[PDB]
Ligand binder design. Structure first.
Ligand SMILES: NC(=[NH2+])NCCC[C@H](N)C(=O)O
Ligand SMILES: NC(=[NH2+])NCCC[C@H](N)C(=O)O
Ligand SMILES: NC(=[NH2+])NCCC[C@H](N)C(=O)O
Ligand SMILES: NC(=[NH2+])NCCC[C@H](N)C(=O)O
Ligand SMILES: NC(=[NH2+])NCCC[C@H](N)C(=O)O
Ligand SMILES: NC(=[NH2+])NCCC[C@H](N)C(=O)O
Lengths: 72, 72, 71, 71, 71, 71
């Protein structure tokens, strides 16, 4: 699994969104599930090529954003 | 569905996030789908082990959480 | 055909499109025809529920009407 | 929903249907109505490919014809 | 969990387990607890169906027996 | 990475590819860039297992080899 899989990252007020190659969703997501609530991720949901991840309390959507880039 | 399939319920300003054992997400989200917008749930979406469920207008997240807890 | 998409609505965070069992990934696929330049930031489908959310600049409201347009 | 299915074929074990992206679940959902008495033992679907199989007392080709019946 | 398993039959190649919707992946993850050693090559679940296949050294009947065993 | 691909084996019906959790859709997409001309009838993939089949004129064994060659 290479960065070549994560096609794009952006976010808004409620969720942080990741775009990947088709079929790589669940794979990049399991990576995010390594992080966790105390690191800012309340949860994560992957489709085929999209991943919606959301911040925990104490965290802003931007905070999560920066934390994920660190993991990636 | 055994209550054991459900590992943890938590939330924030936009969604309630239910974690479950690998694989049980689609099964448990079935229960959440028993309810309709009326009880507050706009929609529900499960992946493999995470479920994001959101509220309808008039009910907040704190609301949906309590609601979910009652159903489980 | 259109029939598959049951209801469309929204709230504070996302727009939720329901479908007949199994068509969520197909209709959600329609949405992926859009893109950032038209409001859509991303879309996830399960079996029969799709959660699409607005990019910065648009609102969950703007996005909503745009999907009806698309449909 | 015909243009969804891109192909049908088979072999010494299953019937292999190909489809447009995300359709795998739609199409396989249609083949789930039939049941064992129609030949089918079961049906599975990934993202764009279904794999169906005839039950005890049925041939793959037969099944291939049967799906072609309800297609 | 067992009341989720609709039925268990089979044929020449696979052992098709039907389940309640969504139950699929859970029951299959159960079979995955077995592994090659018990005569299971590999398993794959959709939404409510589980196609499994025996390993060289056990036939389809045998897989079936050991599955009713597991269950 | 082919490390996401844990084990390969086959039988008288399909080639079974056990991969890391979630990797099953990605790697089936790799086998998906082959098809009939190379002997692949179809390939359906779950969360960590993938099931492929040889077309006509080709044997599962020939496929097991080609699959390693794809790898
Ligand atoms: N190959 C597909 N299923 N494409 C549709 C994907 C739709 C949406 N991005 C999701 O992840 O659910
Ligand atoms: N077996 C897996 N695919 N695990 C990864 C799960 C990714 C994400 N947490 C989801 O549930 O959608
Ligand atoms: N037949 C089912 N698997 N139903 C569960 C649906 C759960 C959720 N609404 C989703 O679309 O993912
Ligand atoms: N976008 C994808 N999921 N691509 C991989 C598809 C793999 C396999 N043909 C399936 O139907 O599951
Ligand atoms: N509610 C649904 N989407 N059902 C699809 C069933 C298709 C097939 N039986 C499978 O296991 O994938
Ligand atoms: N996390 C899971 N859903 N595990 C269950 C896997 C079941 C089966 N081996 C498949 O690939 O479909």
């Amino acid at each position: 699994p290479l960065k070549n899989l994560v096609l794009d990252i952006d976010y808004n007020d409620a969720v942080v969104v990741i775009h990947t190659s088709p079929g790589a969703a669940q794979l990049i997501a399991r990576l995010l599930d390594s992080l966790g609530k105390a690191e800012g991720i309340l949860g994560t949901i992957a489709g085929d090529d999209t991943i919606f991840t959301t911040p925990a309390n104490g965290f802003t959507v931007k905070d999560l954003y920066e934390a994920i880039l660190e993991l990636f």
